[PDB]
């Protein structure tokens, strides 16, 4: 009964919960695992352009520097990845 | 070859582009149409709780008051809907 858009949002929440600890936040090795498992094609397009996105993603997105990614920070990471795909739809190179 | 997470992000960009005008932004009647077509179950759960989410969504999310929703504002709207589903996963009532 859910639409594709509702299923995508529920799916992204359920993906976040594969990787959280008991405080409902994701630690650094779990974030990097999450990226490799769920965004491998995005990560390959970055590598091809000489960008290792996992080198700095945790430090970039851990805004409050508590060394965990909470849901708000995870949504900011998904916004960055979406922004990259949106710019590619307008003719930008991947990972720009 | 895309994963479910990459397909969800590409799908949400493609959904945004069903509803944009030529300036790559969505006007108010098109935003409301987008919500009804793509988030009907979310909108039903809101109605059941006495909240008509379409009454104010455009004015809430049009941050720069140019009377269009651009991609950044659309991503903030998807973050709000995701935040609601995330709170429901933690035992909150829908549309809280
Ligand atoms: O939930 S699914 O319906 O497969 C799904 C549906 C839609 C979007 C999804 C996005 C990321 C991960 C999923 N799978 C997933 C699989 C195991 C645990 C957590 C997420 C997605
Ligand atoms: O693209 S689909 O592969 O169907 C798709 C796949 C994954 C997530 C989607 C989310 C919203 C709309 C879609 N469909 C859609 C259909 C027509 C135009 C724009 C979006 C989604
Ligand atoms: Ca943090
Ligand atoms: Ca605007
Ligand atoms: Zn949670
Ligand atoms: Zn666009």
GROMACS .gro file of C-alpha atoms and ligand atoms in nm:
model
  238
    1UNK     CA    1   0.000   0.000   0.000
    2UNK     CA    2   0.294   0.247   0.048
    3UNK     CA    3   0.403   0.435  -0.259
    4UNK     CA    4   0.761   0.417  -0.397
    5UNK     CA    5   0.836   0.748  -0.222
    6UNK     CA    6   0.699   0.637   0.116
    7UNK     CA    7   0.882   0.298   0.079
    8UNK     CA    8   1.209   0.485   0.006
    9UNK     CA    9   1.182   0.697   0.322
   10UNK     CA   10   1.087   0.398   0.543
   11UNK     CA   11   1.370   0.197   0.377
   12UNK     CA   12   1.632   0.470   0.454
   13UNK     CA   13   1.522   0.475   0.824
   14UNK     CA   14   1.544   0.095   0.839
   15UNK     CA   15   1.892   0.111   0.674
   16UNK     CA   16   2.002   0.365   0.943
   17UNK     CA   17   1.885   0.120   1.212
   18UNK     CA   18   2.102  -0.168   1.072
   19UNK     CA   19   2.407   0.036   1.179
   20UNK     CA   20   2.316   0.225   1.502
   21UNK     CA   21   2.443   0.139   1.850
   22UNK     CA   22   2.220   0.140   2.153
   23UNK     CA   23   2.215   0.520   2.165
   24UNK     CA   24   2.043   0.529   1.816
   25UNK     CA   25   2.363   0.682   1.660
   26UNK     CA   26   2.619   0.538   1.416
   27UNK     CA   27   2.990   0.524   1.508
   28UNK     CA   28   3.270   0.582   1.255
   29UNK     CA   29   3.353   0.225   1.145
   30UNK     CA   30   2.977   0.151   1.114
   31UNK     CA   31   2.928   0.467   0.899
   32UNK     CA   32   3.202   0.363   0.669
   33UNK     CA   33   3.058   0.011   0.643
   34UNK     CA   34   2.712   0.162   0.570
   35UNK     CA   35   2.860   0.364   0.282
   36UNK     CA   36   3.048   0.074   0.130
   37UNK     CA   37   2.738  -0.157   0.148
   38UNK     CA   38   2.479   0.094   0.040
   39UNK     CA   39   2.653   0.345  -0.185
   40UNK     CA   40   2.916   0.140  -0.367
   41UNK     CA   41   2.840   0.284  -0.713
   42UNK     CA   42   2.840   0.639  -0.581
   43UNK     CA   43   3.179   0.562  -0.404
   44UNK     CA   44   3.320   0.411  -0.731
   45UNK     CA   45   3.228   0.723  -0.928
   46UNK     CA   46   3.408   0.932  -0.660
   47UNK     CA   47   3.723   0.709  -0.673
   48UNK     CA   48   3.733   0.739  -1.052
   49UNK     CA   49   3.762   1.120  -1.011
   50UNK     CA   50   4.042   1.089  -0.749
   51UNK     CA   51   3.820   1.147  -0.439
   52UNK     CA   52   3.817   0.900  -0.153
   53UNK     CA   53   3.488   1.001  -0.001
   54UNK     CA   54   3.528   0.782   0.313
   55UNK     CA   55   3.852   0.959   0.417
   56UNK     CA   56   3.660   1.264   0.548
   57UNK     CA   57   3.290   1.189   0.552
   58UNK     CA   58   3.270   1.121   0.922
   59UNK     CA   59   3.453   1.439   1.017
   60UNK     CA   60   3.254   1.645   0.778
   61UNK     CA   61   2.916   1.518   0.891
   62UNK     CA   62   2.975   1.486   1.267
   63UNK     CA   63   2.862   1.849   1.311
   64UNK     CA   64   2.844   1.852   1.693
   65UNK     CA   65   3.180   1.655   1.729
   66UNK     CA   66   3.044   1.396   1.969
   67UNK     CA   67   3.207   1.121   1.750
   68UNK     CA   68   2.869   0.966   1.653
   69UNK     CA   69   2.639   1.034   1.356
   70UNK     CA   70   2.280   1.090   1.481
   71UNK     CA   71   1.974   1.082   1.260
   72UNK     CA   72   1.989   1.451   1.178
   73UNK     CA   73   2.354   1.419   1.065
   74UNK     CA   74   2.269   1.105   0.864
   75UNK     CA   75   1.990   1.304   0.688
   76UNK     CA   76   2.249   1.574   0.607
   77UNK     CA   77   2.475   1.305   0.453
   78UNK     CA   78   2.182   1.170   0.242
   79UNK     CA   79   2.118   1.533   0.132
   80UNK     CA   80   2.477   1.565   0.015
   81UNK     CA   81   2.458   1.241  -0.187
   82UNK     CA   82   2.121   1.350  -0.332
   83UNK     CA   83   2.263   1.693  -0.419
   84UNK     CA   84   2.545   1.521  -0.613
   85UNK     CA   85   2.298   1.307  -0.812
   86UNK     CA   86   2.081   1.616  -0.872
   87UNK     CA   87   2.381   1.811  -1.011
   88UNK     CA   88   2.467   1.504  -1.237
   89UNK     CA   89   2.112   1.518  -1.369
   90UNK     CA   90   2.188   1.878  -1.483
   91UNK     CA   91   2.505   1.769  -1.665
   92UNK     CA   92   2.766   1.781  -1.384
   93UNK     CA   93   3.039   1.521  -1.356
   94UNK     CA   94   2.983   1.269  -1.062
   95UNK     CA   95   3.123   1.360  -0.726
   96UNK     CA   96   3.183   1.727  -0.823
   97UNK     CA   97   2.341  -0.253  -1.056
   98UNK     CA   98   2.234   0.033  -0.819
   99UNK     CA   99   2.155  -0.067  -0.465
  100UNK     CA  100   1.814  -0.002  -0.301
  101UNK     CA  101   1.962   0.309  -0.134
  102UNK     CA  102   2.110   0.450  -0.456
  103UNK     CA  103   1.781   0.370  -0.642
  104UNK     CA  104   1.584   0.556  -0.370
  105UNK     CA  105   1.795   0.871  -0.404
  106UNK     CA  106   1.784   0.867  -0.787
  107UNK     CA  107   1.407   0.796  -0.767
  108UNK     CA  108   1.346   1.099  -0.535
  109UNK     CA  109   1.538   1.328  -0.781
  110UNK     CA  110   1.335   1.190  -1.072
  111UNK     CA  111   1.011   1.244  -0.870
  112UNK     CA  112   1.117   1.610  -0.808
  113UNK     CA  113   1.164   1.653  -1.184
  114UNK     CA  114   0.804   1.533  -1.263
  115UNK     CA  115   0.682   1.852  -1.090
  116UNK     CA  116   0.936   2.132  -1.163
  117UNK     CA  117   0.881   2.423  -1.401
  118UNK     CA  118   1.146   2.542  -1.639
  119UNK     CA  119   1.342   2.709  -1.359
  120UNK     CA  120   1.396   2.363  -1.191
  121UNK     CA  121   1.165   2.468  -0.897
  122UNK     CA  122   0.818   2.348  -0.793
  123UNK     CA  123   0.528   2.596  -0.761
  124UNK     CA  124   0.259   2.567  -0.492
  125UNK     CA  125  -0.016   2.375  -0.675
  126UNK     CA  126   0.249   2.134  -0.814
  127UNK     CA  127   0.390   2.079  -0.459
  128UNK     CA  128   0.051   1.996  -0.328
  129UNK     CA  129  -0.011   1.757  -0.619
  130UNK     CA  130   0.330   1.593  -0.552
  131UNK     CA  131   0.232   1.533  -0.188
  132UNK     CA  132  -0.108   1.389  -0.268
  133UNK     CA  133   0.039   1.152  -0.537
  134UNK     CA  134   0.349   1.046  -0.351
  135UNK     CA  135   0.269   1.067   0.020
  136UNK     CA  136  -0.098   0.973   0.042
  137UNK     CA  137  -0.056   0.734   0.336
  138UNK     CA  138   0.156   0.983   0.527
  139UNK     CA  139  -0.116   1.253   0.454
  140UNK     CA  140  -0.394   1.012   0.570
  141UNK     CA  141  -0.215   0.947   0.900
  142UNK     CA  142  -0.189   1.328   0.947
  143UNK     CA  143  -0.564   1.381   0.870
  144UNK     CA  144  -0.658   1.110   1.120
  145UNK     CA  145  -0.482   1.316   1.393
  146UNK     CA  146  -0.660   1.641   1.288
  147UNK     CA  147  -0.365   1.790   1.089
  148UNK     CA  148  -0.409   1.902   0.731
  149UNK     CA  149  -0.047   1.897   0.630
  150UNK     CA  150  -0.105   2.063   0.288
  151UNK     CA  151  -0.258   2.378   0.447
  152UNK     CA  152   0.087   2.510   0.550
  153UNK     CA  153   0.357   2.298   0.392
  154UNK     CA  154   0.438   2.541   0.115
  155UNK     CA  155   0.469   2.838   0.349
  156UNK     CA  156   0.673   2.645   0.595
  157UNK     CA  157   0.920   2.509   0.341
  158UNK     CA  158   0.954   2.810   0.109
  159UNK     CA  159   1.239   2.940   0.329
  160UNK     CA  160   1.357   3.223   0.100
  161UNK     CA  161   0.991   3.334   0.018
  162UNK     CA  162   1.039   3.340  -0.358
  163UNK     CA  163   0.710   3.139  -0.393
  164UNK     CA  164   0.886   2.832  -0.543
  165UNK     CA  165   1.032   2.521  -0.376
  166UNK     CA  166   1.389   2.461  -0.503
  167UNK     CA  167   1.580   2.139  -0.459
  168UNK     CA  168   1.729   2.239  -0.125
  169UNK     CA  169   1.381   2.320   0.014
  170UNK     CA  170   1.242   1.994  -0.128
  171UNK     CA  171   1.525   1.805   0.054
  172UNK     CA  172   1.423   1.985   0.375
  173UNK     CA  173   1.063   1.868   0.323
  174UNK     CA  174   1.181   1.505   0.268
  175UNK     CA  175   1.385   1.543   0.592
  176UNK     CA  176   1.073   1.646   0.780
  177UNK     CA  177   0.874   1.346   0.650
  178UNK     CA  178   1.169   1.115   0.729
  179UNK     CA  179   1.198   1.264   1.079
  180UNK     CA  180   0.828   1.184   1.138
  181UNK     CA  181   0.874   0.820   1.029
  182UNK     CA  182   1.190   0.797   1.241
  183UNK     CA  183   1.002   0.922   1.552
  184UNK     CA  184   0.720   0.664   1.476
  185UNK     CA  185   0.985   0.393   1.470
  186UNK     CA  186   1.070   0.496   1.832
  187UNK     CA  187   0.706   0.468   1.941
  188UNK     CA  188   0.570   0.818   1.852
  189UNK     CA  189   0.224   0.864   1.711
  190UNK     CA  190   0.222   0.954   1.330
  191UNK     CA  191   0.241   1.317   1.237
  192UNK     CA  192   0.348   1.427   1.589
  193LIG     O1  193   1.389  -0.228   0.345
  193LIG     S1  194   1.374  -0.255   0.205
  193LIG     O2  195   1.227  -0.280   0.185
  193LIG     O3  196   1.455  -0.370   0.159
  193LIG     C1  197   1.414  -0.107   0.129
  193LIG     C2  198   1.311  -0.050   0.054
  193LIG     C3  199   1.334   0.083   0.000
  193LIG     C4  200   1.451   0.159   0.018
  193LIG     C5  201   1.562   0.105   0.089
  193LIG     C6  202   1.680   0.179   0.105
  193LIG     C7  203   1.790   0.134   0.174
  193LIG     C8  204   1.779   0.000   0.228
  193LIG     C9  205   1.665  -0.082   0.214
  193LIG     N1  206   1.668  -0.217   0.261
  193LIG    C10  207   1.699  -0.259   0.385
  193LIG    C11  208   1.721  -0.401   0.395
  193LIG    C12  209   1.760  -0.449   0.526
  193LIG    C13  210   1.761  -0.360   0.631
  193LIG    C14  211   1.736  -0.219   0.620
  193LIG    C15  212   1.705  -0.169   0.491
  193LIG    C16  213   1.546  -0.034   0.143
  194LIG     O1  214   1.172   0.603  -1.066
  194LIG     S1  215   1.133   0.477  -1.007
  194LIG     O2  216   1.237   0.378  -1.053
  194LIG     O3  217   0.997   0.434  -1.045
  194LIG     C1  218   1.153   0.501  -0.839
  194LIG     C2  219   1.247   0.417  -0.778
  194LIG     C3  220   1.279   0.444  -0.639
  194LIG     C4  221   1.225   0.548  -0.561
  194LIG     C5  222   1.125   0.633  -0.615
  194LIG     C6  223   1.069   0.735  -0.537
  194LIG     C7  224   0.974   0.823  -0.583
  194LIG     C8  225   0.931   0.803  -0.720
  194LIG     C9  226   0.981   0.701  -0.804
  194LIG     N1  227   0.924   0.682  -0.933
  194LIG    C10  228   0.910   0.773  -1.031
  194LIG    C11  229   0.824   0.731  -1.139
  194LIG    C12  230   0.803   0.831  -1.243
  194LIG    C13  231   0.874   0.949  -1.238
  194LIG    C14  232   0.962   0.987  -1.130
  194LIG    C15  233   0.978   0.895  -1.023
  194LIG    C16  234   1.084   0.608  -0.757
  195LIG    CA1  235   2.738   1.389   1.599
  196LIG    CA1  236   1.191   2.904  -0.225
  197LIG    ZN1  237   1.634   0.552   1.554
  198LIG    ZN1  238   1.676   1.970  -1.126
   0.00000   0.00000   0.00000
